[PDB]
JSON list of C-alpha atoms in Angstrom, two decimals:
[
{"chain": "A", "resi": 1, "resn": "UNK", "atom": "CA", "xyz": [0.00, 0.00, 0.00]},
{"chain": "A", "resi": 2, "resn": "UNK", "atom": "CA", "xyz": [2.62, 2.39, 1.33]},
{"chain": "A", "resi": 3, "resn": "UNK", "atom": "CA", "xyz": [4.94, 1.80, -2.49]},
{"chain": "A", "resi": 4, "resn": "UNK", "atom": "CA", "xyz": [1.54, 2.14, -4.25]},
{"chain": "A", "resi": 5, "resn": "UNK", "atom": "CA", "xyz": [1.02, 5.77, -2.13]},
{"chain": "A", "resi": 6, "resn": "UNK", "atom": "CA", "xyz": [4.87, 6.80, -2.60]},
{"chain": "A", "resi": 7, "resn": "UNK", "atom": "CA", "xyz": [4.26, 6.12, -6.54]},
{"chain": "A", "resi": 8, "resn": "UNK", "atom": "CA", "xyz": [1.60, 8.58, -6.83]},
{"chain": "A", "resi": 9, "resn": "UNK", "atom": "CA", "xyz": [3.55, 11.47, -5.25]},
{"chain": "A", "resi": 10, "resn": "UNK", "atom": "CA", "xyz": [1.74, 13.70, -7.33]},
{"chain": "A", "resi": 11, "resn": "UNK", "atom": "CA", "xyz": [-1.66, 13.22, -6.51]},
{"chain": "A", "resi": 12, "resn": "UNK", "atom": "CA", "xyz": [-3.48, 13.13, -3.04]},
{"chain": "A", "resi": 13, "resn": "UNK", "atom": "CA", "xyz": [-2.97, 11.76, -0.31]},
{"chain": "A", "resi": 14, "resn": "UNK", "atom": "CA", "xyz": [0.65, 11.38, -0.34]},
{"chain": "A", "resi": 15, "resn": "UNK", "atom": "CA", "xyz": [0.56, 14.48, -2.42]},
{"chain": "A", "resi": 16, "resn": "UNK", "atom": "CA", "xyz": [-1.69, 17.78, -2.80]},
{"chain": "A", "resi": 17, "resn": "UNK", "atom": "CA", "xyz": [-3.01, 18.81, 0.79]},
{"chain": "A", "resi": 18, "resn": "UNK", "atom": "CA", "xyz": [-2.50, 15.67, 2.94]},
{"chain": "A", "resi": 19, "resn": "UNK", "atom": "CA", "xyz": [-3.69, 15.86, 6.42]},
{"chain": "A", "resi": 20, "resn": "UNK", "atom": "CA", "xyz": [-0.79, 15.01, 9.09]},
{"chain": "A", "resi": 21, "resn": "UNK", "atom": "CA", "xyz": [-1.36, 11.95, 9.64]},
{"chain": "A", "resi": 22, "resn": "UNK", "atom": "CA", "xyz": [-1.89, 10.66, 6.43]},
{"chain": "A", "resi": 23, "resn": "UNK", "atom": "CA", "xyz": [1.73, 12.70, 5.10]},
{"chain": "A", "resi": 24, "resn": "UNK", "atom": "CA", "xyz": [3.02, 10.82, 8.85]},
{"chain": "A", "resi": 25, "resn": "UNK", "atom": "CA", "xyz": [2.11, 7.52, 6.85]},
{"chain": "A", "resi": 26, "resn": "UNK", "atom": "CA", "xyz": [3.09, 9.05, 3.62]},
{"chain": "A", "resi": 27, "resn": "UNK", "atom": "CA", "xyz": [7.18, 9.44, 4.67]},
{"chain": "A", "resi": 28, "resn": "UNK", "atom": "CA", "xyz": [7.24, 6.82, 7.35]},
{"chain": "A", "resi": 29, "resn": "UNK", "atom": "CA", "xyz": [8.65, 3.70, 6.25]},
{"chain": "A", "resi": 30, "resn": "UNK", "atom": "CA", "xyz": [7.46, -0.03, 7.33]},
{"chain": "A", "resi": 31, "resn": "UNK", "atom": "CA", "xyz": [9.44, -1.36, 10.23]},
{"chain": "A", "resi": 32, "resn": "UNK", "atom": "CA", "xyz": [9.81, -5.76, 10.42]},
{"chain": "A", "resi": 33, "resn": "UNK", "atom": "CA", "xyz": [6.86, -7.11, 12.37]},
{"chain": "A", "resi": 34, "resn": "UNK", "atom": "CA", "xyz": [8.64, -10.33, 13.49]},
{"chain": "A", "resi": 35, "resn": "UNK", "atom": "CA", "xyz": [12.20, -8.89, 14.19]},
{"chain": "A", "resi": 36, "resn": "UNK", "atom": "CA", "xyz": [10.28, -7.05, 17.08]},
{"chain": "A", "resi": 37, "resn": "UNK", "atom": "CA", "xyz": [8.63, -9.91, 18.84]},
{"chain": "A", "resi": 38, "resn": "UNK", "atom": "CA", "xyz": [10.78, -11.55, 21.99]},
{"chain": "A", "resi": 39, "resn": "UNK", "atom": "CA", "xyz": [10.19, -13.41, 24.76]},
{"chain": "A", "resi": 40, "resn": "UNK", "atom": "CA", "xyz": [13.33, -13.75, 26.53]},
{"chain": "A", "resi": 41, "resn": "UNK", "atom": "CA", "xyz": [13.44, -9.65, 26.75]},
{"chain": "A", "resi": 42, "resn": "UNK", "atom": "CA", "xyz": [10.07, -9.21, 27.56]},
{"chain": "A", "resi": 43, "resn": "UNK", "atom": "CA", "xyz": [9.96, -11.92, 30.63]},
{"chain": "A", "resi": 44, "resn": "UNK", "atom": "CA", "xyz": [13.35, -10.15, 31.98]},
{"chain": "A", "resi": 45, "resn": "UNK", "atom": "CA", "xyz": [11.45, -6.75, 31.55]},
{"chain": "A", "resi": 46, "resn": "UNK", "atom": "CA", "xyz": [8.85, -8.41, 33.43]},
{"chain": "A", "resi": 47, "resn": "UNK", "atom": "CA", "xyz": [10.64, -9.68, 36.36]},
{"chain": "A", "resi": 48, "resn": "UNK", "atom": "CA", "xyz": [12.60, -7.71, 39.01]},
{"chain": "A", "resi": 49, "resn": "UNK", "atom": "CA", "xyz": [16.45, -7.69, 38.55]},
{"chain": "A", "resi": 50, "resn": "UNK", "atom": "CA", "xyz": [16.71, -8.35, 41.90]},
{"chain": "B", "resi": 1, "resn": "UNK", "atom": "CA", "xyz": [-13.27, 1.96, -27.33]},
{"chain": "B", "resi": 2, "resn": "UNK", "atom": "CA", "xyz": [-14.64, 4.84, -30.06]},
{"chain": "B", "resi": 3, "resn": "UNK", "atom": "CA", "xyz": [-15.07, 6.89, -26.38]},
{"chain": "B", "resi": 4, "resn": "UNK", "atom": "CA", "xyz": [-11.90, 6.88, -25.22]},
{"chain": "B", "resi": 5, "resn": "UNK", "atom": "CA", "xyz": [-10.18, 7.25, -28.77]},
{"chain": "B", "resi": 6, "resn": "UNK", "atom": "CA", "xyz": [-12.90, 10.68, -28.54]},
{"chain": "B", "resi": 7, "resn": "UNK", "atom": "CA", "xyz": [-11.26, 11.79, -25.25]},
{"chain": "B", "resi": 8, "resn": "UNK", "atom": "CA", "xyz": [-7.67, 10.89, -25.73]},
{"chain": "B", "resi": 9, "resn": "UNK", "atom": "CA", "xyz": [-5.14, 10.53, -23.46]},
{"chain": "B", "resi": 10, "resn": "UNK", "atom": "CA", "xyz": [-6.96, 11.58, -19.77]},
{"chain": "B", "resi": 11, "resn": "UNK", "atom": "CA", "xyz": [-5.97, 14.69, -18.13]},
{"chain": "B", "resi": 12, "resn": "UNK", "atom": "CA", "xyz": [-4.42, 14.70, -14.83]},
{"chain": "B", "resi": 13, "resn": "UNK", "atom": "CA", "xyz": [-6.37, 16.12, -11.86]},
{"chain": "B", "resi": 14, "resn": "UNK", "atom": "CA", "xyz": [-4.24, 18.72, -10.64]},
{"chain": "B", "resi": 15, "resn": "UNK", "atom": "CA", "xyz": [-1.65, 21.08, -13.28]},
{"chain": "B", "resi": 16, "resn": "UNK", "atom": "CA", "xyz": [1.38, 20.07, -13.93]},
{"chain": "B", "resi": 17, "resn": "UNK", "atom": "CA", "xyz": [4.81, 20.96, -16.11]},
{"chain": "B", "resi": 18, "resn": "UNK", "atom": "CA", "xyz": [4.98, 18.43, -18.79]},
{"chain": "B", "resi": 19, "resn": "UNK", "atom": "CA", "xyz": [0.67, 18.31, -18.74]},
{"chain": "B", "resi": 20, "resn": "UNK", "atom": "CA", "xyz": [-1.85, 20.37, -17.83]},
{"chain": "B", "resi": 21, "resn": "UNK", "atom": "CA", "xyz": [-5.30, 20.25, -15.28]},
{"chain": "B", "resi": 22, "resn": "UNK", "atom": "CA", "xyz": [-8.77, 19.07, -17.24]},
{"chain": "B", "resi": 23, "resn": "UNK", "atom": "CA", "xyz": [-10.10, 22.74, -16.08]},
{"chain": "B", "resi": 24, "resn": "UNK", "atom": "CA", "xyz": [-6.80, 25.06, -17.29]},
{"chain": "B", "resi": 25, "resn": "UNK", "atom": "CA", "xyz": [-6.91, 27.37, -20.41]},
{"chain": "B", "resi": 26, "resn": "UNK", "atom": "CA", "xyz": [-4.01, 25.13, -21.90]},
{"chain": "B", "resi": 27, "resn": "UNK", "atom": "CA", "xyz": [-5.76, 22.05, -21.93]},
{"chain": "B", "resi": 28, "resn": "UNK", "atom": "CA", "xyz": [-8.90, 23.16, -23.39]},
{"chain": "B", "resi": 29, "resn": "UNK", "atom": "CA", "xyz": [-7.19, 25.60, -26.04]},
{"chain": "B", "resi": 30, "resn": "UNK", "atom": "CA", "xyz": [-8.78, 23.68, -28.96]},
{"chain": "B", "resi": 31, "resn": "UNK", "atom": "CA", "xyz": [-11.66, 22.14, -27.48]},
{"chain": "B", "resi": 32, "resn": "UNK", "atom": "CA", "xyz": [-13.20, 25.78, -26.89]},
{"chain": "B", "resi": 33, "resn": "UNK", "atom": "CA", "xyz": [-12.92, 26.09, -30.78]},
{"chain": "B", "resi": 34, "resn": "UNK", "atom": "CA", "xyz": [-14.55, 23.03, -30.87]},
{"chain": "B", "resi": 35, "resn": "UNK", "atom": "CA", "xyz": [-17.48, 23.06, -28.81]},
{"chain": "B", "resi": 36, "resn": "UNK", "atom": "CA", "xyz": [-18.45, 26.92, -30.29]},
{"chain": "B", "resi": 37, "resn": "UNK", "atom": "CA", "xyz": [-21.38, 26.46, -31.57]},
{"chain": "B", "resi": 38, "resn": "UNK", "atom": "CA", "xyz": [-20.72, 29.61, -33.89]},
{"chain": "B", "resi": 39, "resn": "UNK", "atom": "CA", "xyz": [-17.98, 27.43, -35.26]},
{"chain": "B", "resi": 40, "resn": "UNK", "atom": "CA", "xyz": [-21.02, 25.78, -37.12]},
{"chain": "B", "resi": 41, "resn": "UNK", "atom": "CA", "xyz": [-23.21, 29.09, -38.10]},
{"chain": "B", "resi": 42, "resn": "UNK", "atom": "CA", "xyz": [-21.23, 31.82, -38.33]},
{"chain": "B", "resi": 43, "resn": "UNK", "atom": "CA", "xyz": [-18.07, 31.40, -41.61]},
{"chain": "B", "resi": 44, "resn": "UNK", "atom": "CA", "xyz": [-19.85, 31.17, -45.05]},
{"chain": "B", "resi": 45, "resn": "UNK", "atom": "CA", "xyz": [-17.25, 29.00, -46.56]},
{"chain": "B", "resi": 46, "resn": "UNK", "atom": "CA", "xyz": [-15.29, 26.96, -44.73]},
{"chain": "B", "resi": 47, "resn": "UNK", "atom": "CA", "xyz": [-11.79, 26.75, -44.86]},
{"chain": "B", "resi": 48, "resn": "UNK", "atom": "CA", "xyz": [-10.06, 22.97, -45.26]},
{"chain": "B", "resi": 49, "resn": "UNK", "atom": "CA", "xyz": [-7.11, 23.97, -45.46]},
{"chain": "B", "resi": 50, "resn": "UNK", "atom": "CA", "xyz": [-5.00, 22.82, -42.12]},
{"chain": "B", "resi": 51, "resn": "UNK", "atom": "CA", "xyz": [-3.76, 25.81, -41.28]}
]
């Protein structure tokens, strides 16, 4: 969706008058979805260091 | 088909460098001319030649 905005950057939304948080969108790239998930640092967030 | 070849390549939305708007002066230079209707009424001889 995002390439199919980026290669209409002459047209609206990604273009014209966007509203912010469409133009946000618009120049924000897509981060990895599955890189992000992790247990082991999550459960020692979780727990007390002590 | 006959429609399109009638309306030609489709003009962006908003103006631009290389092509203009549907609604700006340069796009509808000729089709002005066209749609007169005193293009029809007015000449008593019409000229062919492509001028």
């Amino acid at each position: 969706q995002r390439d199919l905005y980026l290669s209409q950057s002459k047209s609206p939304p990604c273009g014209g008058n966007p509203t912010p948080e469409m133009n946000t969108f618009c120049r924000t790239a897509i981060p990895d979805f599955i890189s992000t998930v992790n247990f082991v640092k999550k459960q020692n967030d979780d727990t007390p260091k002590d | 088909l006959v429609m399109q070849n009638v309306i030609g390549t489709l003009p962006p939305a908003q103006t631009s460098g290389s092509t203009p708007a549907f609604y700006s002066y340069k796009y509808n230079q000729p089709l002005i001319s066209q749609l007169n209707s005193n293009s029809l009424i007015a000449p008593l001889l019409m000229d062919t030649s492509a001028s």
